[PDB]
Amino acid sequence: YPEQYNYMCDIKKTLDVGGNSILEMPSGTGKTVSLLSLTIAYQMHYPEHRKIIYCSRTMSEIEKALVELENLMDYRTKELGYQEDFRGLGLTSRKNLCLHPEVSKERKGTVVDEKCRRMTNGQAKRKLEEVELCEYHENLYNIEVEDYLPKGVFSFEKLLKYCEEKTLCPYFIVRRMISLCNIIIYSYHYLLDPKIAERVSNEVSKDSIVIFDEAHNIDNVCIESLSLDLTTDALRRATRGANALDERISEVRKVDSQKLQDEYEKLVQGLXXXXXXXXXXXXXXXXXXXXXXXXXXXXXXXXXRAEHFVSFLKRLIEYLKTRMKVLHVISETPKSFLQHLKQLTFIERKPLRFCSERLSLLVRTLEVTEVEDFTALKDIATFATLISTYEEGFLLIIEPYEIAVPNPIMRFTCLDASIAIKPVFERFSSVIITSGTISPLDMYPRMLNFKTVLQKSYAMTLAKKSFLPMIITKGSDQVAISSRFEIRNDPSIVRNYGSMLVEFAKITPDGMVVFFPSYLYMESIVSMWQTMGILDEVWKHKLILVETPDAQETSLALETYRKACSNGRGAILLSVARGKVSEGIDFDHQYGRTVLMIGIPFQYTESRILKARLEFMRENYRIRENDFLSFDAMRHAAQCLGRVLRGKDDYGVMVLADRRFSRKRSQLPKWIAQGLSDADLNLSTDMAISNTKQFLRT
Amino acid sequence: IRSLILTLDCSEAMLEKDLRPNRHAMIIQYAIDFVHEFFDQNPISQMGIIIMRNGLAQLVSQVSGNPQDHIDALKSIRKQEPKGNPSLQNALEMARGLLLPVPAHCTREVLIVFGSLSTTDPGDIHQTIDSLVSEKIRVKVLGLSAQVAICKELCKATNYGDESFYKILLDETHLKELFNEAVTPXXXXXXXXXXXXXXXXXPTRIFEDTPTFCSCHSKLVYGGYFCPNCHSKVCSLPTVCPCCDLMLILXXXXXXXXXXXXXXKTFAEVPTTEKFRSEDCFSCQSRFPXXXXXXXXXXXXXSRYRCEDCKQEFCVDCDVFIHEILHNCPGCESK
Ligand code: SF4
Ligand SMILES: [Zn+2]
Ligand SMILES: [Zn+2]
Ligand SMILES: [Zn+2]
């Protein structure tokens, strides 16, 4: 297409000149546009030069990038007939990319890495003094296994079928292939990870092209990278964790004390640098981004041992129980909290180095370490690292007396979000920053200050196939401002609002997806709707997303929605616009052809996390009470806009309520304001003109 | 030759007042005219009416070449009320049971007039769509306003991988246009199969009405057609005789074949200043100028429909009259 070549000519001009480019793409029409241009810019330069680094936001976009790369290789092996050096690696999760917990453990949780380190150290125990390895170890690091990926594309699903037929291990293949540096596909929770990105950055070895995919929730990952709640039950875990270290120091000082004494001399000489260098293929500890923390020349509790280090920790946790034992609403400065700590116990200014050495020590010392006890130590050690350094932008908040039973909840606020995005500019050049759910894109020069260029979507044609209307008067224009309040004011109007939804769904019963800014509006009408005619004569079955949406429940509601439209039935997808599963897969008639939105998306106000980030960005960019209610409300609405635009071949109608949407912008701003009963006759025309103009424009 | 199975929607979705006075009062009314459009151009073809009422499929007209059986079947539907929901699976499985007596030499067609937006099928409807391709059944659905994803797969997989048969109607004038194209056959590219048909006897026009004679009814008659094989004076019809399974057509099949062989040569509309001929018609006398928009820049220009088969000048009126009925351009018969 000529519109796809407009962004491709900009991608061929920025990858060889600029270092970071904010390129806007239309929804459902920019997936393979930058995919083929990334392999063409490498083919125009050198094919072993800068490899492609993909950064998705969900696991679905990781899976959708693999099938498009197969189409890139099929277009390069059929139009050319030459099989070059293949690439592509499916860096997914650990519970999905495994074989051993899917046979004996039968658990698909976050404990798949615990059996991984038990088999890694079990193979280490079987190759030093002596369970053993696993099903297929001591063979995945061979040279023939390193050549199974530049010759054949085996990523994720193709590699999981390859590790069963050839009897291999999916963990040691992918971990040995980050050093090979292929087309790496991963999500946003791995690049800004304080336990994973320290290992990823030592294997890619830089000098590549970072492809930011759907870069609109970048400010959310930097907040989600920190902020851990301490809801007082970890104090019971830290109390039982402190007594376990007392029995472990009693067990270490009863017989085999030379293993701890030689480790004490190794920490008094080689410190943490030699301790990390000697430790290989074992369970790594935790830190607050060692590539961003930058600290050397440490000391082990001032030349002391583990018996003196656990005394400071037991001194530390009782002070933490002392500070949590407070009244209600109280803010805390991270520097002033450290001063009040030193008035209680002189723990110096470096507990960041007093914990990461002792976490690696107890793994080497205690062999049968408890799961809940050692994780209780890591929750304290992650907090001890954040109170030692990184005080600029940091803030400690206390939850108030909320019945008070659930009152002792301690949380720390993250620093600036520009700090986490900082080291990706000096490590990589020509970082392609793309997102299809941004309108406008001027907040990214504002918030997160980096020098970049701005390019908009230069693709807008065939407005007769992209119906973009909006509803204003709902028969009386009263339920539009009624949903604007946070509290469910006047439920009789909401029962009148829910009465209009049965009338709106009975007009076009051909795939309906309803989003919500909160689950309170879903739970308000579901108690006594008194209106099931659409749930018995139109949509029949009901697909409502709950607040506690299970992964299996979201999977079963998605497949049955595809089973409803493939049987001539149609279903109502009652989802949350602020909830999980942002979707993105459409391009068919099985999706909801008419998408409904209840008002505008809102945010949870009157919270200490919001009031802290309000005054933090007030000093930075002075965007108080503006972008927090509009730029955040747009991106939660733009996830609903990315599903209607499913290419130029498929049509779709997206209606928007209220009147506050006119103050913001939108992707392809062609919007006509009409009433609710007026659009019922307009959509009946749009569902018949588009069926007659499809064969006219071809 | 043809054995069309009419599938009509008779449910509560047809109770809406989209048409005048409603959907059901125009679907039944225009289908009677479609019976008149079908048996005239195809006098030796078959028809079958299957309604979809109360979630089922009811057979109101048996498969027969008599046009009066399908008229009186539609006169009983307008008396009652369309209720329930359409059942596409029960209607197609009933259409499969009637097209199995129809041989492979006779073309099997299914026309669906679907004015609803939601159907009620028992089992999987995708097992019924693939069955129509296995026995080669050409299915055509006429959907109202919005499109159904089921009818896109039904009008494509049963139609040689081509979706162009699921048409969307928007007016009552456009609904009669669908009955004109469905009255005409579908000479496609097919799949290149063998075809051979025989046993076609001729009907002797007998007019004996004294004590009468009837081999298919045993009643009084004012004259019936005598079969050339079993020698039976049954009912006068151009279909098959009901006593030895032999045909009894005449010039009715010849008129259908003449319309089928009618390629209809449209006359080339050349101007009077370009064809260098006066305004005249080969069929009548069109001595008036065609174009007359401008002063003398169009009035002297005009247009003369010159048929390329005999270089005869004509107008726009007789060019559509010669292509509709009779022979295409009367100058072709003279050399
Ligand atoms: S070697 Fe691989 S399959 Fe075996 S336990 Fe470790 S991660 Fe799981
Ligand atoms: Zn006979
Ligand atoms: Zn004439
Ligand atoms: Zn002629």
Q: Are B40 and B182 in contact (CB under 8 A)?
A: no
Q: Which of A226, A194, A191 is nearest to A210 (CA)?
A: A191
| A27 labelled ligand-binding | yes
Which ligand lies nearest the alpha carbon of B321? 3
Residues A680-693 as b or e (16 or more Cβ within 10 Å = b): bebbeebbbbbbee
> Degrees (nearest 5) of the Cα angle A211, A212, A216?
165
- Residue by residue, DSSP assigns A195-216 as TTHHHHHHHH-S-SEEEEESTT
Q: Which amino acid is it at A325? A: K
Measured between alpha carbons, how far is residue A121 from residues A282, B171, B300 in Å? 6, 76, 101
Q: Which residues of chain B have a CB within 8 Å of the CB of A538?
A: 118
Min Cα–Cα distance to chain B from A28, Å: 21
Residue A101 Cα: closest atom of ligand 1: 8
Q: φ and ψ at A434, to 5 degrees?
A: -125, 145
| CB pair distance less than 8 Å for B149 and A688 | no
What was the experiment behind these coordinates? cryo-EM
Only one residue has tokens 């991988």, namely B161
Q: Which residues of A138-173 are buried (b: 16+ CB within 10 A; e: fewer)?
A: eebeeeebeebbeeebbbbeebbebbeeeebbbbbb
Distance from Cα B271 to the centre of ligand 4, integer Å: 18
A239 is in an annotated binding site: no
Q: Do A510 and B146 touch (CB under 8 A)?
A: yes
Contact yes or no for B170 and A692 at CB 8 A: yes
* Ligand (nearest to CA of B199): 2
What distance in Å separates the CA atoms of residue B244 and residue B228, rounded to the nearest whole number? 10
Please choose, from the candidates A289, A298, A305, A296, the residue with its C-alpha nearest in 3D space to the C-alpha of residue A361.
Answer: A305
B182 at the A interface (CB within 8 A)?
Answer: no
Residue with tokens 């067609």: B109
Query: Which runs of consecutive H residues, i.e. helices, occur in A366-485?
Result: 371-388, 417-421, 423-427, 443-446, 479-482
Contact A154, A18 (CB under 8 A): no
**A692 a known binding residue?**
no
Tokens of B80: 């009652």
CB neighbours of A51 closer than 8 A, spacing ≥ 6?
A: A42, A87, A181, A182, A183, A184, A208, A209
CB contact under 8 A, B147 and A569: no
Q: CB–CB of A652/A467 below 8 Å?
A: yes
Distance between Cα A194 and ligand 1 center (Å): 23
One-letter amino acid at B332 equals C
A169 close to ligand 1 (CB < 6 Angstrom): yes
Report the residue from A568, A688, A695 with minimal CB separation from B150.
Answer: A568
CA A120 / ligand 1 centre spacing (Å):
8
Q: Which residue carries 């370009």 as its tokens?
A: B274
Q: Which two structure tokens, joined as six digits, stand for A80?
A: 């050319």
Question: Which residues touch A180 (CB under 8 Å, ≥6 apart)?
Answer: A146, A149, A150
Helix A306-324 with A334-344: angle, nearest 10 deg = 120
Return d(Cα A387, Cα A380) in angstroms, integer: 11
Q: How far apart are CA A101 and CA A111, in angstroms?
A: 9
Cβ-count burial of A515 within 10 angstroms (0-12 exposed, 13-18 middle, 19+ buried)?
buried
Dihedral angle of Cα B35, B39, B40, B42, to the nearest 10 degrees: 130
Query: Sign of dihedral through CA atoms B53, B57, B59, B64?
Result: positive
A99 lines ligand 1 (CB under 6 A): yes
- Which are the contacts of B170, defined by CB distance < 8 A and separation ≥ 6? A688, A692, B145
- Resolution limit in angstroms? 6.7
B145 Cα to chain A: minimum distance (Å): 5
DSSP A227: -
**Is the CB of B145 less than 8 angstroms away from the CB of A590?**
no
Asked if B225 and B235 count as a contact pair (C-beta separation under 8 A), the reply is: yes
Q: Measured in Å, how far apart are chain A's first and last C-alpha atoms?
A: 15
Chain A environment of B148 (Cβ under 8 Å): 510, 568
Q: Rounded distance, CA A482 to CA A560, Å?
A: 33
| Residue from B176, B228, B164, B223 nearest B199 by CA | B228
* Helix, strand, coil percentages in chain A from 3-state DSSP, rounded to 5: 45, 10, 45
Task: Please list the helix, strand and coil fractions of chain B in percent, rounded to the nearest 5, in that order.
Answer: 25, 15, 55
